[PDB]
Design a protein around this ligand. Structure first.
Ligand code: OLA
Ligand code: BOG
Length: 292
């Protein structure tokens, strides 16, 4: 369990499920946002290598796992950013500025959140964030455009419904992926099948005109030290995105990881956790120097 405890917090009829350890102290608290179709426990690999003197919060994103799934919820990046601000206000996480960490769709929400509520965030860590406008499409984005041409919504690579589709999703999302036995693939996809209608609705909403490039559209408003962590072998969100952010945001440190695909937090958890803590210390040192 790593000392992480699951709790639920309510905003009227909406509930957020989150895991946590430690308590608000002198250092900035850390709020972690997972990616598309995942949940708060994808952060456990990194938490295992994080120090115990930090206040860590890992929240299930809107409609995922223990957080409310409602047909009336606004699943656009703007609406998810707003839900995250309600959750933050619920826990009083912004009592003093906090460090905000996000991966992929969570990375996009994190970037847009720092642009919407700049006084809430002390520093940002964006792990292969979605929401950028690339000059050319990688094979995955060319596949999505091809699927749009036949409206084959049942073939979205990140929404598998069969063992063979699950094996393709596992290959696309990680650099090293040896073949898994059919029984294990079947078990992995069965836990996701009841949630595929929601993932299909969420996916179409985050790739819609209003959300597809919202991080790129808001990155001029990010005013805090930002760390970018990206895997050079990312087959989902191309690693060229790291330079687009770095050249558009001041005080930006880029960490390109070798032998690493889209699932950074699962593939390189030790290096990722080390980079997270090192960046936190360098931000504190520059803040102590800048005084007066
Ligand atoms: C149906 C329209 C097709 C056009 C696509 C336009 C560009 C957007 C394409 C891909 C972005 C995918 C972002 C999904 C979240 C990343 C996965 C994750 O969170 O791990
Ligand atoms: C990933 C593509 C799978 C097949 C999608 C079938 C067509 C869905 O429809 C399209 O979805 C887009 C994305 O939300 C919208 O931008 C378009 O307006 C809409 O017509």
């Amino acid at each position: 369990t790593l000392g992480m405890q699951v709790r639920y917090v309510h905003h009227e009829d909406y509930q957020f499920c989150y895991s946590f350890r430690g308590r608000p102290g002198h250092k900035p608290s850390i709020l972690m946002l997972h990616g598309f179709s995942a949940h708060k426990d994808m952060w456990l690999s990194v938490v295992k290598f994080l120090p115990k003197n930090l206040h860590l919060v890992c929240v299930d994103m809107p409609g995922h796992e223990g957080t409310t799934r409602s047909s009336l919820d606004d699943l656009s990046i703007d609406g998810q950013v707003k839900r995250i601000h309600q959750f933050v206000e619920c826990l009083k996480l912004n009592k003093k500025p906090f460090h905000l960490v996000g991966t992929a769709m969570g990375g996009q929400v994190a970037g847009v959140y720092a642009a919407y509520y700049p006084s809430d965030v002390s520093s940002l860590c964006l792990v292969c964030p979605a929401g950028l406008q690339y000059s050319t499409d990688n094979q995955f984005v060319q596949r999505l455009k091809e699927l749009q041409g036949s409206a084959a919504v049942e073939k979205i690579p990140l929404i598998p419904s069969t063992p063979e589709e699950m094996s393709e999703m596992l290959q696309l999302c990680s650099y090293v992926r040896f073949k898994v036995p059919q029984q294990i693939l079947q078990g992995l996809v069965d836990v996701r099948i009841p949630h595929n209608n929601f993932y299909r609705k969420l996916f179409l909403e985050i790739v819609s005109e209003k959300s597809r490039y919202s991080l790129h559209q808001n990155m001029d408003k990010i005013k805090v030290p930002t760390q970018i962590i990206w895997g050079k072998q990312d087959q989902v969100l191309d690693v060229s995105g790291a330079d687009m952010l770095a050249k558009s945001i001041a005080n930006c440190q880029v960490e390109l990881l070798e032998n690493c695909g889209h699932s950074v937090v699962m593939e390189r958890p030790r290096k990722t956790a080390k980079l997270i803590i090192d960046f936190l210390a360098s931000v504190h040192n520059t803040d102590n120097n800048k005084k007066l």
